[PDB]
Amino acid sequence: MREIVHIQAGQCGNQIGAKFWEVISDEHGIDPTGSYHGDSDLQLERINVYYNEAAGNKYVPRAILVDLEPGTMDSVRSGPFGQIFRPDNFVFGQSGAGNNWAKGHYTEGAELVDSVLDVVRKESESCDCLQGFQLTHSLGGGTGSGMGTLLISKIREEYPDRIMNTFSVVPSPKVSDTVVEPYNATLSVHQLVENTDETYCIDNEALYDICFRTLKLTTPTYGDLNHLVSATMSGVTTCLRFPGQLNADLRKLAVNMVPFPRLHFFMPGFAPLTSRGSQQYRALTVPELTQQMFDAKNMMAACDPRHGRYLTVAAVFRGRMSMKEVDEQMLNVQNKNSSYFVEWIPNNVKTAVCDIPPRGLKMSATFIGNSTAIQELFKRISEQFTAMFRRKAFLHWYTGEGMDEMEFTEAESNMNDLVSEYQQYQ
Amino acid sequence: MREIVHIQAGQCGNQIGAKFWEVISDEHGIDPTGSYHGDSDLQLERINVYYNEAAGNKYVPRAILVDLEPGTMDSVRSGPFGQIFRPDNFVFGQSGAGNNWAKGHYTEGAELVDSVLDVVRKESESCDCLQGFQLTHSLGGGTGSGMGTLLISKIREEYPDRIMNTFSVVPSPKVSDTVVEPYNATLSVHQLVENTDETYCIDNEALYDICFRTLKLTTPTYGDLNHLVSATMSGVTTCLRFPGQLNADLRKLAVNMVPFPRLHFFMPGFAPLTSRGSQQYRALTVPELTQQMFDAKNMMAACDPRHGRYLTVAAVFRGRMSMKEVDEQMLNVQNKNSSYFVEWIPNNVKTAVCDIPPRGLKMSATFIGNSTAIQELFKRISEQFTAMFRRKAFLHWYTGEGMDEMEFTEAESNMNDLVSEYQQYQ
Amino acid sequence: MRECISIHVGQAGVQIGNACWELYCLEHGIQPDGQMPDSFNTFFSETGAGKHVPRAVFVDLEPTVIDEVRTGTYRQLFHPEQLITGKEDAANNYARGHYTIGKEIIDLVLDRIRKLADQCTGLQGFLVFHSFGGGTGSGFTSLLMERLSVDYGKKSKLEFSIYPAPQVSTAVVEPYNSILTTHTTLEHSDCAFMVDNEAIYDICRRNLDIERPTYTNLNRLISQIVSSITASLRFDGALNVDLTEFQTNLVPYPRIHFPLATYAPVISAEKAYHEQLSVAEITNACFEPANQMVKCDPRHGKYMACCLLYRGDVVPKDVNAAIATIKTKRSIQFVDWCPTGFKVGINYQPPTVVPGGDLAKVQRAVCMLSNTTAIAEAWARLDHKFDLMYAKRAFVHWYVGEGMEEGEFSEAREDMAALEKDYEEVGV
Amino acid sequence: MRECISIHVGQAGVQIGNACWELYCLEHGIQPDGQMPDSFNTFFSETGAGKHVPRAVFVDLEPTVIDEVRTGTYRQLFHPEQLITGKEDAANNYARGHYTIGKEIIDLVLDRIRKLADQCTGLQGFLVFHSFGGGTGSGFTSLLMERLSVDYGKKSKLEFSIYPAPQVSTAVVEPYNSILTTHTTLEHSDCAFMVDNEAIYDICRRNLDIERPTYTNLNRLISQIVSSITASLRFDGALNVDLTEFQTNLVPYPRIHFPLATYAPVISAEKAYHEQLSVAEITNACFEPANQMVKCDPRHGKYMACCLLYRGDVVPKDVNAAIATIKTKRSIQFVDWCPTGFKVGINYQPPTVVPGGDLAKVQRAVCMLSNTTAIAEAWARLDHKFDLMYAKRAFVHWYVGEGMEEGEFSEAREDMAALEKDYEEVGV
Ligand SMILES: Nc1nc2c(ncn2[C@@H]2O[C@H](COP(=O)(O)CP(=O)(O)OP(=O)(O)O)[C@@H](O)[C@H]2O)c(=O)[nH]1
Ligand SMILES: Nc1nc2c(ncn2[C@@H]2O[C@H](COP(=O)(O)CP(=O)(O)OP(=O)(O)O)[C@@H](O)[C@H]2O)c(=O)[nH]1
Ligand SMILES: Nc1nc2c(ncn2[C@@H]2O[C@H](COP(=O)(O)OP(=O)(O)OP(=O)(O)O)[C@@H](O)[C@H]2O)c(=O)[nH]1
Ligand SMILES: Nc1nc2c(ncn2[C@@H]2O[C@H](COP(=O)(O)OP(=O)(O)OP(=O)(O)O)[C@@H](O)[C@H]2O)c(=O)[nH]1
Ligand SMILES: [Mg+2]
Ligand SMILES: [Mg+2]
Ligand SMILES: [Mg+2]
Ligand SMILES: [Mg+2]
């Protein structure tokens, strides 16, 4: 009961997905072969949420891997945990998208997509009651953004009543990796606005800051960064996988955190986060976790929560904890930091608690905030788009893939409207 | 009780027959010498359906091998299992037919045929209650098509009340092996229309697709292809050879699957079919088998079932299975895919179950569909015939063998009529 | 004295019969070889020392199903001459059953039956097990029924028939066979107990907690019903019911002889521990639509007569109480022309359970046989199914081939229409 | 005879119910397997030998909470058919509870309830455990209450409800759910006992010396109250109270059926040694605002009726003395239209304590149920909360999606306004 379908689109998305799978298999006591070697019966009770049971006491991720390039697939298959995936669930093209949203959405991606659709239909049929979909990808390139968006549109058309979740790695302001990133992000964000129910805005710059400042890590690799994201992902769906004292799944979270249809862009967070040295000089207690989570410098989106207000915040706690203590701490934070919370939604905080902690830790926390500061992310992007579009820079490539200028105009308008709406509800 | 007589005509037919025999001997625990070395008493209980018992605890196929060329016979005799066949049951000519239906039907084949007739009469006399005949051949050449057809006509004349089954390998559209294939197919199809009770339309292109796409096989040889066909053949008659929970033989299948006399052209299918790699990541269960069988890409005829409707479909299941589960799955498929089934024949599905699974597998399935999409196969052929015949191309050869133009006109008309009838009942 | 002859026709009939005979053996302490280490005489003849032989004939047009019996566990129980086998089947064709194939074997089976009947001194009648859908179960049975009616007539005829489902049908041509056999059925058999596999499946999943029931599970359940029916003859209870008595009570008009049965309790081993399965409880459960053996809504029909057959640790007073309670339930309506709609039997022997069976051992059980107008709904759907197919003459040629005439089909349809109309009229 | 059916709805309802059933078992000497190595019949059916089964139905739209019960310590106590589980939750949405998800499961639960009720010969009524804030606890319960009212009606209905706090709310949408369920609650349930988690927490920290109370600690305390209520039915005391009696005494007008409860003494193991916990003392402690189960000031309200339920080593004379003393306290005011505001019950059995519990074993205890105008304050704050959110239509779209109409919200608000006004009028 309550099966989730996982989709990974483009290189980054795939990489994050791999990490996610690795963590979750470890959590549920699943080895690199698909065999259960755990101790606790609780690890297998709700195994069906993320895994299909294959013949001969093995488990396989309900995961679809998508890319316009084959190399990524190979890299995944050769990775630790690569062999756990169903071979028929790898759907790859041969060409690539060349950082072009149009190639991913209209051309190469279009050709690819039917296969993917066929796979995912089968995966849906297999599951007794699919609660919904989780897509991991980025907005800045061509595949994850254009192809991903296309896929999402198709999915929603066939499953309009199911929950649609995306973990979207967004382009940061300073660390600009590509030149057409503004275009790709703009086009994809628009589509996300209409077709996702909740969007987790993850930002590389913020991750780097976390790694450098909070973990004090000498050399971050993408893997390390990805780990953080994976942890966050695991946090959200802990209530579907384990028992607890107060239980909240994907739907319950959405209903409590989304007051208006369009405002479904979250700034996620995780706690605790310490170095090796600073491990000894700390208190493993709920007050400390709470303190950590609400800090601006612990957000995985490059936005200052002190530049806006929280519309709603959901906190998900893992480990053996006193409910009273949890409640006290959340009330204290809202009373003390009154100015950071919208005053016309009393009790801006939703709490959920799962008894099963993550491995290595006795207590852990996951944060989901709907903050009006997310407007900053959109605004910058809009500005950059304007700067490009005013001089029609790089437009020709997109138009060569069948895209028309008017779409760009529309998307930009839409994003502007969204920004305005956030501002006004602040 | 209930003896079947096997006939193999022309090279392809012979080759398929060899494979068929090999599989069946293995199944019934019969070695290359004709001796029973099996374990189960169930393997010998109904051995007489396909084997005559010779002196000294040996078994011999009730098989007649026919060719206008002797080389094929030699090749068969030198094969693994070649020595099991009765030497007197090889009936061969010396000349060959040169891809000419007329040579096979009117001239060389005519001269040959009396011997064959004499053999088969004896084989009939030997058997206590012959249920009928199975002919394996192709429509595109001269021997299997012309000689085969001739043989069938003769047989039906002497056994008008017995069941007449053909496994006919049909010419595909793209992979055209010969130039006069259209002619040979047209002429033979006509004859089949009047003289066979059920015709299994097997297509090389579809087989290749199965091998390449579904089995992921690096290099298919004809042997591999033939194996698939053999499996299918074995499936149909499993109910005559073993016990079961619900039993259906050749007659029962025909009566349930043929609503109108002329509409007896089946698209057969088999399941399960997996690679070596994809063996581990699968569920050995009835739902999965069902899913596999009904897919368009698992049909051994190059026709899209989604281009027509199923008039009737017979499913034959082998292994220890729950009847309820089987029934649920078949009802689900018809309810979900309502549009692919003719609405004026309620319960378009017939089910049969045999307790004895094939070797190596715990569960297996054989599919027989009477689909209106088979019209495509006829239509293409008709078109090609027209294209040739309009310019009288290659006609002279046929006429030199005594054939008249009017026969061609007749056959073409007949086929057209058949096509029309299929279309209208769609 | 009091003896019942069992006839098992076609695959279904054979397989139900196997289960039945397994159950009977266990009930009377007869081993699979006929030896026992008295009432069992109602089902078995006794020959010499250390032998008892079932008063049964097994008939099939194929060898396959019967051949299993010959090879199997109960090979010594039946003598070879009571297992009758042809060479070719009816191939799901009524015509082949009734005419082409059936006319070759019917005489033989009749002769054997006569031989069997001559050995019995107090023949109660016949129990006939078959299906409506198969060529043998339909065509052969209709032929056999005619002959039996001619030869014996006044001796009672009972048929236990696997009716085809609305949704879950295994074969394509079922409606034709069903319609054809109904015509002769109405003419001949004196009371006919319809059952539906789909309903049984539902029961096994919901009440017995079995994910995947196979035919062996259905058959066992079916056998239980038969046991309840015949326990009044095979044991000595407080208050008893004979077959003639049953007929008198349960069949109000000659044509209206289709009472649908049901059993209670059908429960798991574990789920029995918590439930206090009282007489009142089981009785209440009997009159619930979910536990029915045929798919239909009694709430939309009216009861004409119900027979309640209790077995085991049951006392009359509490049965009476249960009946009274049932009377006062507005949602269970009986027709106005029958104010007293109960025949009640109580037998001392608890239901015995087959080792490795799905049913738990209980102190009490009940088999309700009720005649209700709601059964007409089944006929309506079947008729509808028939009419579609016949509109296109689909498959008809096959039947014609074996000597059937098109006019027969129409006649059969008419007969069924008339029957449905009759059912309509009695419920007003 | 005298029997009470318990219904446990949603997470909160389930978890309170677990505690309750743990307590009952210990009280009556029933082991977790249903075996006992008579009055317990009020809560348990008895089946065969060595078994007793709770007269309870556990309902949740998810599997998770109930699945714990199935796996856990008391898996053998309940039979599987009394534990009802859907597939998808109400997701903190009233609409999903009442309509979209609830309409799929309500029939089933009703049928089971009817089955349960048919086994009881002297039905007193129903105890319904839930919360006002959850989608299931609100939406499902309202639906269920309607159906129960229809089917039974005159049989008493009691609900034990976890009311949302003023400050410490765990969920965002609580006010909407609370308002919606209140409308149906007023229509149907006959008396409703509100409780607040915040108050319980305060009590546990201040009176029990627990730094960190978890839900298990609250639940245990809550169960005690229920035990006090039902001890008059489960034991034979000197002076007794039935549920109908309670209703008669405590509810002065049909709409004014919200009495807030409280328990005394709630003390630590050590702090019990020094205190001489007399009847007078505990009684005095009952009427103090700090020990209340709902956050509000009684000093600012008026009492309309109080029921005092004493248990253990208590004699009437000293209870009377205590009551007299309470009468003479000017700070505790009763409305002028009720000069005699006491119903008094005294039961012989001391409060039993759960091994590993927070409460010490005492010779005497009391449960006070009082109807007071001060409860109106809670409704005022809740209404205020509702009105803010609704001003912006925040979250409303979700409810609309599941078939709720905006007009319903307004109607509900109006109903609550009317209720508050009614409360105002009776205190004048
Ligand atoms: N947080 C992470 N960000 C990544 C990772 N890999 C890439 N990226 C970021 O994502 C962007 C590059 O995205 P992709 O390779 O996924 C573009 P994609 O293959 O989807 O389409 P193409 O344009 O066809 O290559 C860029 O901002 C990278 O800096 C990763 O492992 N973690
Ligand atoms: N599926 C298979 N198809 C085959 C096989 N061998 C040949 N064929 C196909 O059949 C056709 C060639 O047929 P044949 O050699 O049987 C013609 P035949 O000997 O019957 O008459 P002649 O004209 O006298 O040779 C052609 O379409 C081949 O591609 C086989 O082993 N399997
Ligand atoms: N209840 C039950 N029904 C069965 C069983 N086997 C077959 N059926 C039903 O019987 C019908 C098929 O008829 P069969 O008895 O197999 O056919 P037959 O009597 O052997 O007739 P032919 O094979 O056509 O000669 C279908 O409705 C099946 O669902 C069984 O073991 N139990
Ligand atoms: N006293 C007490 N209150 C609880 C407990 N668990 C949850 N709550 C309260 O119940 C309310 C939340 O409702 P739940 O019962 O969790 O929700 P639900 O009934 O399962 O409804 P959905 O999950 O939305 O379908 C909040 O006011 C919680 O504080 C518990 O064990 N004891
Ligand atoms: Mg890439
Ligand atoms: Mg050749
Ligand atoms: Mg049969
Ligand atoms: Mg819940």
mmCIF file of C-alpha atoms in Angstrom, chain C residues 225-414:
data_model
loop_
_atom_site.group_PDB
_atom_site.id
_atom_site.type_symbol
_atom_site.label_atom_id
_atom_site.label_comp_id
_atom_site.label_asym_id
_atom_site.label_seq_id
_atom_site.Cartn_x
_atom_site.Cartn_y
_atom_site.Cartn_z
ATOM 1 C CA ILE C 225 -23.191 -28.979 1.031
ATOM 2 C CA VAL C 226 -23.851 -32.441 -0.377
ATOM 3 C CA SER C 227 -22.891 -33.998 2.959
ATOM 4 C CA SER C 228 -25.376 -31.737 4.753
ATOM 5 C CA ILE C 229 -28.116 -32.760 2.316
ATOM 6 C CA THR C 230 -27.399 -36.508 2.757
ATOM 7 C CA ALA C 231 -26.424 -36.538 6.510
ATOM 8 C CA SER C 232 -30.155 -36.931 7.372
ATOM 9 C CA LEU C 233 -30.004 -40.327 5.534
ATOM 10 C CA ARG C 234 -26.465 -41.324 6.673
ATOM 11 C CA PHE C 235 -26.967 -40.492 10.376
ATOM 12 C CA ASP C 236 -29.695 -40.636 13.006
ATOM 13 C CA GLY C 237 -30.547 -37.176 14.297
ATOM 14 C CA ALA C 238 -33.202 -35.625 16.530
ATOM 15 C CA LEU C 239 -35.347 -34.290 13.682
ATOM 16 C CA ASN C 240 -34.835 -35.630 10.121
ATOM 17 C CA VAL C 241 -35.411 -34.899 6.430
ATOM 18 C CA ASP C 242 -35.733 -37.340 3.494
ATOM 19 C CA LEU C 243 -35.295 -36.408 -0.184
ATOM 20 C CA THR C 244 -38.981 -36.822 -1.039
ATOM 21 C CA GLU C 245 -39.786 -34.684 2.021
ATOM 22 C CA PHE C 246 -37.348 -32.050 0.808
ATOM 23 C CA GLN C 247 -38.961 -32.033 -2.621
ATOM 24 C CA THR C 248 -42.415 -31.675 -1.086
ATOM 25 C CA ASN C 249 -41.358 -28.770 1.059
ATOM 26 C CA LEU C 250 -39.079 -26.803 -1.231
ATOM 27 C CA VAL C 251 -40.710 -26.981 -4.693
ATOM 28 C CA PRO C 252 -44.061 -25.099 -4.804
ATOM 29 C CA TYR C 253 -44.801 -25.593 -8.558
ATOM 30 C CA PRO C 254 -43.342 -28.248 -10.913
ATOM 31 C CA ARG C 255 -41.299 -25.781 -13.072
ATOM 32 C CA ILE C 256 -40.004 -23.729 -10.085
ATOM 33 C CA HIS C 257 -37.457 -26.243 -8.940
ATOM 34 C CA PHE C 258 -34.244 -24.187 -8.662
ATOM 35 C CA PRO C 259 -33.317 -23.568 -5.028
ATOM 36 C CA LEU C 260 -29.943 -21.926 -4.465
ATOM 37 C CA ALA C 261 -27.965 -23.240 -1.504
ATOM 38 C CA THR C 262 -25.618 -21.775 1.080
ATOM 39 C CA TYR C 263 -23.436 -22.928 3.922
ATOM 40 C CA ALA C 264 -22.501 -21.512 7.364
ATOM 41 C CA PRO C 265 -19.981 -21.068 8.954
ATOM 42 C CA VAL C 266 -17.139 -20.896 6.390
ATOM 43 C CA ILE C 267 -14.245 -19.671 8.565
ATOM 44 C CA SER C 268 -10.514 -19.891 9.040
ATOM 45 C CA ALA C 269 -8.785 -21.868 11.782
ATOM 46 C CA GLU C 270 -7.693 -18.740 13.663
ATOM 47 C CA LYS C 271 -10.856 -16.674 13.072
ATOM 48 C CA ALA C 272 -12.908 -19.485 14.723
ATOM 49 C CA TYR C 273 -11.194 -19.041 18.122
ATOM 50 C CA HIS C 274 -12.466 -15.503 18.648
ATOM 51 C CA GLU C 275 -15.989 -15.977 17.249
ATOM 52 C CA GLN C 276 -18.610 -17.646 19.485
ATOM 53 C CA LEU C 277 -20.283 -19.441 16.553
ATOM 54 C CA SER C 278 -23.809 -19.853 18.013
ATOM 55 C CA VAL C 279 -26.933 -21.258 16.316
ATOM 56 C CA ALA C 280 -28.386 -17.755 16.106
ATOM 57 C CA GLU C 281 -25.203 -16.365 14.561
ATOM 58 C CA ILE C 282 -24.853 -19.013 11.852
ATOM 59 C CA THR C 283 -28.559 -18.750 11.014
ATOM 60 C CA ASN C 284 -28.215 -14.971 10.674
ATOM 61 C CA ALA C 285 -25.180 -15.419 8.433
ATOM 62 C CA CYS C 286 -27.118 -17.812 6.201
ATOM 63 C CA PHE C 287 -29.561 -15.041 5.158
ATOM 64 C CA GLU C 288 -26.810 -12.545 4.168
ATOM 65 C CA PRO C 289 -26.200 -12.015 0.375
ATOM 66 C CA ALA C 290 -22.357 -12.127 0.647
ATOM 67 C CA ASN C 291 -22.298 -15.846 1.648
ATOM 68 C CA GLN C 292 -24.468 -17.014 -1.303
ATOM 69 C CA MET C 293 -23.290 -19.714 -3.761
ATOM 70 C CA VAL C 294 -24.898 -17.897 -6.726
ATOM 71 C CA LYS C 295 -24.293 -14.234 -7.592
ATOM 72 C CA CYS C 296 -27.560 -12.268 -7.222
ATOM 73 C CA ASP C 297 -29.394 -9.960 -4.779
ATOM 74 C CA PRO C 298 -32.089 -11.675 -2.618
ATOM 75 C CA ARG C 299 -33.000 -8.201 -1.216
ATOM 76 C CA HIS C 300 -34.428 -7.505 -4.701
ATOM 77 C CA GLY C 301 -36.298 -10.878 -4.732
ATOM 78 C CA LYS C 302 -38.782 -12.772 -2.545
ATOM 79 C CA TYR C 303 -38.362 -16.104 -0.721
ATOM 80 C CA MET C 304 -40.906 -18.852 -1.497
ATOM 81 C CA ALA C 305 -39.508 -21.531 0.760
ATOM 82 C CA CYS C 306 -36.393 -22.050 2.820
ATOM 83 C CA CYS C 307 -35.116 -25.330 4.201
ATOM 84 C CA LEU C 308 -32.607 -25.115 7.066
ATOM 85 C CA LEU C 309 -30.488 -28.220 7.674
ATOM 86 C CA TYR C 310 -28.575 -27.961 10.976
ATOM 87 C CA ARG C 311 -25.859 -30.404 12.046
ATOM 88 C CA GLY C 312 -23.934 -31.097 15.242
ATOM 89 C CA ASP C 313 -24.517 -29.687 18.759
ATOM 90 C CA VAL C 314 -27.875 -27.978 18.066
ATOM 91 C CA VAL C 315 -31.078 -27.832 20.169
ATOM 92 C CA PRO C 316 -34.517 -27.062 18.641
ATOM 93 C CA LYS C 317 -35.478 -24.133 20.900
ATOM 94 C CA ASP C 318 -32.629 -21.859 19.849
ATOM 95 C CA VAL C 319 -33.206 -22.735 16.153
ATOM 96 C CA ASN C 320 -36.821 -21.663 16.688
ATOM 97 C CA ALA C 321 -35.632 -18.419 18.276
ATOM 98 C CA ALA C 322 -33.365 -17.768 15.297
ATOM 99 C CA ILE C 323 -36.225 -18.408 12.894
ATOM 100 C CA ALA C 324 -38.438 -16.006 14.851
ATOM 101 C CA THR C 325 -35.752 -13.328 14.648
ATOM 102 C CA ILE C 326 -35.395 -13.885 10.906
ATOM 103 C CA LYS C 327 -39.188 -13.498 10.544
ATOM 104 C CA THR C 328 -39.075 -10.026 12.111
ATOM 105 C CA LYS C 329 -36.396 -8.761 9.653
ATOM 106 C CA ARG C 330 -38.201 -6.527 7.076
ATOM 107 C CA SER C 331 -35.249 -6.770 4.554
ATOM 108 C CA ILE C 332 -35.866 -10.568 4.204
ATOM 109 C CA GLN C 333 -39.276 -10.849 2.489
ATOM 110 C CA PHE C 334 -41.307 -14.004 1.842
ATOM 111 C CA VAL C 335 -44.135 -14.128 -0.761
ATOM 112 C CA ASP C 336 -47.664 -13.600 0.710
ATOM 113 C CA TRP C 337 -49.013 -16.953 -0.615
ATOM 114 C CA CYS C 338 -46.655 -18.842 1.744
ATOM 115 C CA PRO C 339 -46.891 -17.522 5.369
ATOM 116 C CA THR C 340 -44.972 -20.553 6.730
ATOM 117 C CA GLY C 341 -41.724 -20.668 4.693
ATOM 118 C CA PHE C 342 -39.484 -22.917 6.796
ATOM 119 C CA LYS C 343 -38.593 -26.577 6.675
ATOM 120 C CA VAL C 344 -36.122 -27.409 9.437
ATOM 121 C CA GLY C 345 -33.834 -30.415 9.852
ATOM 122 C CA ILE C 346 -31.540 -31.069 12.814
ATOM 123 C CA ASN C 347 -28.895 -33.843 12.745
ATOM 124 C CA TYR C 348 -26.586 -34.869 15.629
ATOM 125 C CA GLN C 349 -23.314 -35.374 13.702
ATOM 126 C CA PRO C 350 -20.975 -32.316 13.558
ATOM 127 C CA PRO C 351 -19.479 -31.457 10.139
ATOM 128 C CA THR C 352 -16.347 -33.555 9.591
ATOM 129 C CA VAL C 353 -13.313 -31.852 8.053
ATOM 130 C CA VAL C 354 -10.898 -33.187 5.438
ATOM 131 C CA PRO C 355 -7.225 -33.238 6.489
ATOM 132 C CA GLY C 356 -5.470 -30.356 4.705
ATOM 133 C CA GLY C 357 -8.774 -28.567 4.063
ATOM 134 C CA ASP C 358 -9.437 -24.804 4.257
ATOM 135 C CA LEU C 359 -12.346 -25.091 6.772
ATOM 136 C CA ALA C 360 -11.953 -25.221 10.554
ATOM 137 C CA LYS C 361 -13.598 -27.875 12.768
ATOM 138 C CA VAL C 362 -16.820 -26.516 14.265
ATOM 139 C CA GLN C 363 -19.420 -27.779 16.768
ATOM 140 C CA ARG C 364 -22.305 -26.482 14.634
ATOM 141 C CA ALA C 365 -23.106 -25.903 10.979
ATOM 142 C CA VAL C 366 -26.042 -25.212 8.659
ATOM 143 C CA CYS C 367 -26.982 -25.667 5.023
ATOM 144 C CA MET C 368 -29.823 -23.459 3.821
ATOM 145 C CA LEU C 369 -31.691 -24.328 0.630
ATOM 146 C CA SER C 370 -33.938 -21.460 -0.465
ATOM 147 C CA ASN C 371 -36.205 -20.945 -3.469
ATOM 148 C CA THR C 372 -36.093 -17.223 -4.387
ATOM 149 C CA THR C 373 -37.339 -15.168 -7.304
ATOM 150 C CA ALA C 374 -33.964 -13.333 -7.482
ATOM 151 C CA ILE C 375 -32.446 -16.339 -9.318
ATOM 152 C CA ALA C 376 -34.388 -15.129 -12.395
ATOM 153 C CA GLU C 377 -31.764 -12.379 -12.705
ATOM 154 C CA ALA C 378 -29.102 -14.948 -13.587
ATOM 155 C CA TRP C 379 -31.310 -16.303 -16.360
ATOM 156 C CA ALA C 380 -31.869 -12.760 -17.647
ATOM 157 C CA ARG C 381 -28.141 -12.105 -17.982
ATOM 158 C CA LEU C 382 -27.553 -15.524 -19.554
ATOM 159 C CA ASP C 383 -30.389 -14.933 -22.025
ATOM 160 C CA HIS C 384 -28.920 -11.538 -22.901
ATOM 161 C CA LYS C 385 -25.535 -13.140 -23.523
ATOM 162 C CA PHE C 386 -27.151 -15.793 -25.725
ATOM 163 C CA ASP C 387 -29.081 -13.221 -27.716
ATOM 164 C CA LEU C 388 -25.996 -11.153 -28.605
ATOM 165 C CA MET C 389 -24.070 -14.137 -29.931
ATOM 166 C CA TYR C 390 -27.067 -15.536 -31.801
ATOM 167 C CA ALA C 391 -27.683 -12.130 -33.422
ATOM 168 C CA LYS C 392 -24.523 -12.821 -35.456
ATOM 169 C CA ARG C 393 -25.008 -16.661 -35.576
ATOM 170 C CA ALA C 394 -21.529 -16.811 -33.975
ATOM 171 C CA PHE C 395 -20.183 -20.413 -33.636
ATOM 172 C CA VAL C 396 -23.583 -21.835 -34.759
ATOM 173 C CA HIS C 397 -22.175 -23.717 -37.742
ATOM 174 C CA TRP C 398 -20.306 -26.090 -35.360
ATOM 175 C CA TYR C 399 -23.524 -27.206 -33.703
ATOM 176 C CA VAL C 400 -25.214 -27.613 -37.091
ATOM 177 C CA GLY C 401 -22.301 -29.795 -38.240
ATOM 178 C CA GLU C 402 -23.086 -32.324 -35.477
ATOM 179 C CA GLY C 403 -26.774 -32.544 -36.467
ATOM 180 C CA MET C 404 -28.322 -29.684 -34.478
ATOM 181 C CA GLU C 405 -30.942 -27.563 -36.250
ATOM 182 C CA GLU C 406 -31.234 -23.737 -35.940
ATOM 183 C CA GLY C 407 -34.883 -24.085 -34.925
ATOM 184 C CA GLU C 408 -33.801 -25.906 -31.768
ATOM 185 C CA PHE C 409 -31.914 -22.804 -30.603
ATOM 186 C CA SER C 410 -34.964 -20.596 -31.020
ATOM 187 C CA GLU C 411 -37.135 -23.171 -29.252
ATOM 188 C CA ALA C 412 -34.720 -23.287 -26.330
ATOM 189 C CA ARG C 413 -34.710 -19.502 -26.093
ATOM 190 C CA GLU C 414 -38.512 -19.462 -26.092
#
